Amino acid sequence: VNSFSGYLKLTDNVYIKNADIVEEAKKVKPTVVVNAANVYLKHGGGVAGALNKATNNAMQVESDDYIATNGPLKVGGSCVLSGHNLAKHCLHVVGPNVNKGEDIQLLKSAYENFNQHEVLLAPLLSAGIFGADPIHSLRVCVDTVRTNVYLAVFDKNLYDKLVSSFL
Ligand SMILES: O=C(O)C[C@H](NC(=O)c1ncnc2[nH]ccc12)c1ccc(O)cc1
């Protein structure tokens, strides 16, 4: 039993809710929140911009130190950093950005990072400003993640479409 509330169950291990991941993280304080990161951990907009703003830029400060030490992530890769005031940990995961020309096949690799964590609060990878089809992102999520994932979908119209078209 965990603290997530109001989610629709899609599968044994995948759940979905129309919610702002920032407000959801602040309420649940999950062990792991997933950030829709880029390889440079520059949290300028989208989910990443929103999560970083909610940390009063502490996420960005920590991220800049991480990059100065380790260099950029790989597309499809991830790193674990602090969750600051939002969660115990933040799993920064780099889904491919279609608006940069990156291979959509890397989306499965991106979701594989979730399997290293028993329970996660997460957005749909590569959706929104990363330019992929969210219906597809959801299919890959369900077919790749085996741990317990709670998806927060910001847009109500998108959420209703995701549920009504789910196979
Ligand atoms: O629809 C989606 O969920 C994908 C994408 N989502 C986010 O960027 C997002 N997801 C969850 N929590 C969040 N908090 C702040 C941003 C945010 C999106 C959003 C709006 C839109 O019109 C089209 C796609």
Curated annotation (Swiss-Prot):
Q: How does it sit in the membrane?
A: Multi-pass membrane protein
Its domain of life?
Answer: Viruses
According to the record, the protein's activity is controlled as follows: Inhibited in vitro by GRL-0617.
Q: Where in the cell is it found?
A: Host endoplasmic reticulum membrane
Instruction: Please report the stretch or stretches of sequence annotated as the Macro domain.
Output: 1-167
According to the record, mutating residue 164 to L results in: In strain: Gamma/P.1
Q: Which reaction does it catalyse?
A: Thiol-dependent hydrolysis of ester, thioester, amide, peptide and isopeptide bonds formed by the C-terminal Gly of ubiquitin (a 76-residue protein attached to proteins as an intracellular targeting signal)
| Residues forming coiled coils | none
Biological function? Responsible for the cleavages located at the N-terminus of the replicase polyprotein. Participates together with nsp4 in the assembly of virally-induced cytoplasmic double-membrane vesicles necessary for viral replication. Antagonizes innate immune induction of type I interferon by blocking the phosphorylation, dimerization and subsequent nuclear translocation of host IRF3. Also prevents host NF-kappa-B signaling. In addition, PL-PRO possesses a deubiquitinating/deISGylating activity and processes both 'Lys-48'- and 'Lys-63'-linked polyubiquitin chains from cellular substrates.
Q: How does it assemble?
A: May form homohexamers. Interacts with N protein.
Please give the name of this protein: Papain-like protease nsp3
Species for this entry: Severe acute respiratory syndrome coronavirus 2 (2019-nCoV)
Q: Which residues of the full protein are shown?
A: 1025 to 1191 of 7096
